[PDB]
Design a binder for these strands. Structure first.
Lengths: 115, 68, 237, 89, 135
RNA sequence: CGCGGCAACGCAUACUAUUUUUCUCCGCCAAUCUUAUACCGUUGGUAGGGAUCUCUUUCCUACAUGACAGUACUAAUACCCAGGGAAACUGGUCAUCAGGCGAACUGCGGCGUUCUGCUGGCAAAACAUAGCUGUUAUGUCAAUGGCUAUUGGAUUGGU
RNA sequence: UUGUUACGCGGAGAGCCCAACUGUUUAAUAAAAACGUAGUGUCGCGCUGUGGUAGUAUAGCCAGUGAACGCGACAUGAAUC
């Protein structure tokens, strides 16, 4: 046997795009098949963790997939994972609630002068 | 080239006015495969020799049928 | 003679700053009329500069790569302005700050960017308030009238004590000047022949000429100790 | 077993660079690798990321400290200076 | 003790997270072994409307969409506010059946109590509830 | 002509603009685990050819399936969720370690990336024997290791 | 009595001189003790500045996406005394 095989594409050098793997054909012939690139896929802002419920494919072929599988259902579905969204609800409530209670406070405190 | 499990769903795919031919073909374990051609895909249907006779009749008359 | 290595740094072909991985120009936001809160999004390290930078957000989000005081942390709220209180972080004008305290990245002109006291583990000290001009002492010793309206970050710059540790190997200094610029290694002037440098030549290596030259001395001629009002071991004083 | 008697962390350098320099770096190389106690999440896993920067792993936060320790003495004095003036008035 | 019927809440996580709610029946069961409380809420809020273009554009932004859900105590954030009579009781009188199953049966409630709850927005009462919050 | 799940998330949904974020996307070195390919192996087997004074149930060749598309349960590690509520500290790695900012542990949890099996592509092709004058026959099988290497990937550490 | 069988695989020790060390160098007679280096020291300058360059356009270029724990100019050449 001789199991050595040529590169098919005219680029010679061993770059990240020009990488191969040996494969058996139907005809008992070893041959170069070219490796498609790895994808990390969507990490989140804050912390820097992998969100769940989406494949790491290319974002161009993420368009060809269904609108279901592009996203997670919640508010800030893609961008922010779960517990960071919980914290944004709690803070943006109580920042606004303290500011709303400040308008109640400055209403209530100034009425003491009249009575 | 997709496979299709149900014989009922095959006959829905046959009567689309896409399909150019069906191919009958003997297989291992005394089965046979009805390979419906469509413009996009090639829908195969594995079947046992119990329900082999009925399916051919089920197929639309207009569609051409090439035996192998 | 040939043109000497001191003269050749001007023409500036190979002697340029290696400015590729540098993240941006470190300065304040422009002045624009009180008090404005600003979250530290993150603190990052840029190559060449020994200090960190801290990227602020004055949320639109307006950004500003400010140079980092020590004790800043991520998601601290920095407060630029007059009526901001004293914390290590905050950016006050020199009217407001107390004298006899250590400040960082102080501007020369108002609305400028920040000028004096920028490198790691340095700080301008404040002497006293005249009226308009808040007098401050720079890290060297020298003292400078600077206008009270212009801004300065509070505290000492981060990354202090980097030259405390020596670099044992030539390779560590190779990686040091890769980020900065080509100026290394230095071949000494005595070693070179007479045409290349002033100190060069002779059967035995030696300087020969006095080796200490005026401000009036020309390009090509200014080599060695320039206008040295003292030399030798600085014993006392 | 302890295996070097004297040297410690500077055993990597071998016979090179002199006795006085390896004494100096022995102090500093122990400092910059050591995990330090966090303020914010509490836990003891504050490593050195770059020169001035000290990332906590478990927080996901960072602080600006010294080059080879997270607390410079001179910067720690500046806190005490601005404390006494703020506490006054 | 805190989880009564007459109290507003905010949803912490889920599909409806951020959005407003009120408790109905604060309960262990054999169906689901944890603390859980059946809630009302609102999905799409009524936006503000200028009186230019009467009738037609109003009756869209008028209409308020609802939801019902059997939610854990951890995933709801309790609030200051309480409901202030018979009307509060009526909306929560029937709701478990819709929650349990059958879309048509549950859609009969949400079509009904959309019309009932909207007439409280007509009066400008429960002014906190029908207003959203910005993140 | 918007619904399921306590939740992680699932499933059939538009367009213009502004802003924000992500993928594209990134140094070097070291270790562990694992597909694919090659090679060496224990178990047999059948096809043809080589060898033979003697010996050798022998020796050699052959024993194979592409991009692409699908959905089973086996079983992994990463991360997250529900219950659970930990010093007589427990769990875990080749190694460092992890945990009341919530561990062990239970779910026929969620999800990503790899994996085994079963198909479609698919035997109609290709290859090897046997025979007829272009084509007809059989056959390409069954079991299961790698302490070996290279490649892709995973889990990490150090500088 | 021979065996890392062929193939492949350090002769070793004791003095003295120079440079500490890895590294660089006269392409084509010199690879060194020369150059380099870490370490040590001196001098200049707080930006309308300092060390250059550039050339008639009141051109703007380099250090400079810089600021004395810095930039530039030299001399010595690890440590120990």
């Amino acid at each position: 046997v001789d199991n050595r095989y040529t590169l098919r594409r005219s680029l010679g050098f061993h770059t990240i795009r020009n990488r191969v793997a040996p494969v058996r054909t139907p005809g008992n012939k070893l041959v170069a098949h070219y490796i498609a690139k790895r994808q990390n896929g969507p990490h989140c802002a804050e912390t820097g963790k992998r969100i769940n419920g989406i494949k790491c494919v290319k974002t161009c072929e993420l368009r060809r997939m269904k609108k279901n599988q592009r996203t997670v259902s919640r508010p800030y579905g893609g961008v922010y994972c779960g517990s960071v969204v919980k914290d944004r609800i709690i803070n943006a409530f109580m920042e606004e609630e303290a500011r709303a209670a400040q308008e109640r406070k400055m209403a209530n405190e100034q009425k003491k002068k009249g009575k | 080239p997709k496979q299709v499990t149900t014989p009922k769903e095959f006959l829905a795919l046959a009567a689309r006015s896409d399909a150019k031919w069906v191919k009958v073909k003997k297989a291992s374990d005394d089965n046979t495969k009805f390979k419906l051609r469509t413009t996009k895909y090639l829908y195969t249907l594995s079947v046992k020799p119990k329900f082999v006779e009925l399916v051919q009749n089920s197929i639309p008359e207009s569609l051409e049928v090439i035996v192998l | 003679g040939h043109i000497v290595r001191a003269q050749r740094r001007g023409n500036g072909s190979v002697f340029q700053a290696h400015t590729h991985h540098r993240v941006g120009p470190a300065k304040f936001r422009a002045l624009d009329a009180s008090v404005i809160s600003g979250m530290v999004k993150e603190i990052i390290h840029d190559p060449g500069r020994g200090a960190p930078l801290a990227k602020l957000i004055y949320k639109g989000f307006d950004s500003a790569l400010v140079i980092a005081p020590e004790g800043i942390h991520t998601g601290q709220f920095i407060k630029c302005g007059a009526q901001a209180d004293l914390h290590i972080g905050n950016i006050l004008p020199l009217a407001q700050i107390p004298e006899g305290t250590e400040i960082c990245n102080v501007e020369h002109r108002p609305g400028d960017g920040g000028r004096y006291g920028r490198c790691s583990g340095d700080s301008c000290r404040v002497i006293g308030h005249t009226e308009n001009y808040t007098r401050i002492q720079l890290p060297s010793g020298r003292k400078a009238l600077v206008s009270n309206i212009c801004r300065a970050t509070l505290g000492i710059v981060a990354g202090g004590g980097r030259p405390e540790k020596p670099l044992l190997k030539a390779g560590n200094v190779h990686y040091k000047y890769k980020a900065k610029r080509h100026t290394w290694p230095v071949v000494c002037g005595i070693k070179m022949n007479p045409v290349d440098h002033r100190h060069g030549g002779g059967s035995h290596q030696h300087m020969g000429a006095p080796g200490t030259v005026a401000r009036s001395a020309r390009p090509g001629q200014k080599l060695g100790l320039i206008a040295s009002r003292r030399t030798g071991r600085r014993r006392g004083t | 077993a302890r295996r070097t008697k004297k040297v410690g962390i500077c055993g990597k350098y071998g016979v090179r660079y002199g006795a006085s320099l390896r004494k100096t770096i022995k102090k500093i190389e122990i400092s910059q690798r050591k995990k330090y106690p966090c303020a914010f999440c509490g836990k003891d896993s504050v490593k050195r990321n770059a020169v001035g920067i000290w990332t906590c792993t478990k927080c996901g936060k960072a602080v600006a400290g010294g080059a080879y320790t997270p607390t410079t003495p001179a910067a720690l004095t500046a806190r005490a200076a601005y404390k006494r003036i703020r506490e006054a008035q | 003790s805190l989880l009564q019927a007459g109290r507003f809440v905010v949803m912490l996580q889920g599909r409806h997270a951020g959005k407003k709610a009120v408790v109905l029946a604060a309960y262990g069961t054999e169906d689901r072994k944890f603390p859980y409380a059946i809630v009302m809420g609102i999905e799409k809020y009524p936006k503000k409307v200028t009186k230019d273009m009467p009738t037609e554009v109003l009756v869209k932004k008028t209409q308020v969409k609802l939801f019902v859900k059997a939610v854990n105590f951890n995933h709801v954030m309790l609030t200051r506010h309480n409901v202030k009579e018979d009307f509060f009781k009526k909306i929560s009188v029937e709701k478990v059946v819709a929650a349990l199953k059958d879309a048509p049966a549950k859609k009969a409630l949400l079509t009904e109590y959309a019309a009932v709850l909207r007439q409280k927005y007509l009066n400008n009462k429960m002014a906190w509830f029908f207003k959203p919050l910005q993140f």
